[PDB]
Design a protein around this ligand. Structure first.
Ligand SMILES: Nc1nc2c(ncn2[C@@H]2O[C@H](COP(=O)(O)OP(=O)(O)OP(O)(O)=S)[C@@H](O)[C@H]2O)c(=O)[nH]1
Ligand SMILES: Nc1nc2c(ncn2[C@@H]2O[C@H](COP(=O)(O)OP(=O)(O)OP(O)(O)=S)[C@@H](O)[C@H]2O)c(=O)[nH]1
Ligand SMILES: [Mg+2]
Ligand SMILES: [Mg+2]
Lengths: 190, 183
């Protein structure tokens, strides 16, 4: 049906618009401004690229600009995947992903079984990796791995302002493509 | 609320009032703080299809304000025009050229996808009473050329789309047709 909706959720200022621009254009968002309301960009995605079953899909990235009233629940309809974005320099943004994710999966809590049972693909992306001093890099990656595990989610950590963070063939780009393939599969080829 | 997705494009020149209109349609409140819309903005109009009947069904109607200009060759935004169930064509009543460009916007979509159309003129309040006659003649031609209902309004007046108003009846009928012709 070619239609795919992926929410991009996280606290204000964590880098959602910068990430989406990188995912959709392989270019850094040079002039980021405060996102008002819901911004949508489209990633033209080759499903199963390189295979005889290769098929192009338009993946909508819905960049919701709210904070954890309940009027943004209307944006959470018909969701096929969720990207949960946190700022690695800002532990509070990481904590709030427990609220961001529940806000969709229900429409200050953590229920491990709710995430064992959830079928909507989840991807946890930590931004501003470049700002993490290497002495503390190890500690933040351990914390972030446990975060991905709580959500039963793949994790990617990157610098949204570095085009090599998502350059073709890179480890990040492969994980991103795998996530988008899973979104498409669970909506259609299930 | 239905899980079916309903997509309405909101097209028109920059600055004609698209964000103010969308915000009024989706929130029944005036956009107090309008800024230059960067990229594609989406808001949701919650619409009760067949309200009052045993078949009443709620739809989330996506209003996609894609943006851009009809002077480009850019024009990579064609992927935003897929799976369209309706189009709102917005022009500024004080700006005749924005009305002429609606002919370009419509062709740009009908080359890059009968989709229901609604033609909305903004800034009615800026129309001097002397020029009201000329502006009604012009907008009737848009309605006829696009085979569309037409609404002219002031997006900065909250009552311009209030429930029970003639404008709200036309809007509701348009959204019914969007649903009836798709989803
Ligand atoms: N160094 C570095 N800066 C980043 C990174 N990601 C985002 N930024 C910067 O952080 C600021 C916020 O980025 P932005 O993309 O606007 O966040 P946002 O989540 O969209 O913010 P908002 O719209 O809810 S206000 C910008 O100045 C941007 O350049 C990153 O990975 N590394
Ligand atoms: N008097 C009056 N002013 C209006 C009306 N509609 C919009 N405006 C004003 O016109 C200006 C532009 O409105 P806006 O809603 O931002 O247009 P836009 O098409 O979204 O502009 P852009 O995002 O492409 S830059 C705003 O100052 C707004 O308050 C109207 O019906 N009457
Ligand atoms: Mg933003
Ligand atoms: Mg605007």
């Amino acid at each position: 049906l070619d239609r795919v909706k992926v929410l991009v959720l996280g606290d204000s200022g964590v880098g959602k618009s910068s990430l989406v621009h990188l995912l959709c254009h392989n270019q850094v968002l040079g002039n980021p401004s405060w996102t008002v309301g819901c911004s949508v960009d489209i990633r033209v995605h080759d499903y199963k690229e390189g295979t005889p079953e290769e098929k192009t899909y338009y993946i909508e990235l819905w960049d919701v600009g709210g904070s954890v009233k309940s009027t943004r629940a209307v944006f959470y309809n018909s969701v096929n995947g969720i990207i949960l974005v946190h700022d690695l320099t800002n532990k509070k943004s990481s904590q709030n992903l427990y609220r961001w994710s529940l806000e969709v999966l229900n429409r200050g809590d953590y229920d491990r079984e709710q995430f064992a049972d959830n079928q909507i693909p989840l991807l946890v992306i930590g931004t501003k990796l470049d700002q993490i001093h290497e002495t503390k890099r190890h500690e933040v990656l351990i914390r972030t791995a446990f975060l991905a595990e709580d959500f039963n989610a793949e994790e990617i950590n990157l610098d949204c302002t570095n085009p090599r963070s998502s350059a073709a063939g890179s480890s990040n780009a492969v994980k991103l493509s795998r996530f988008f393939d899973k979104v498409i599969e669970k909506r259609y080829f299930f």
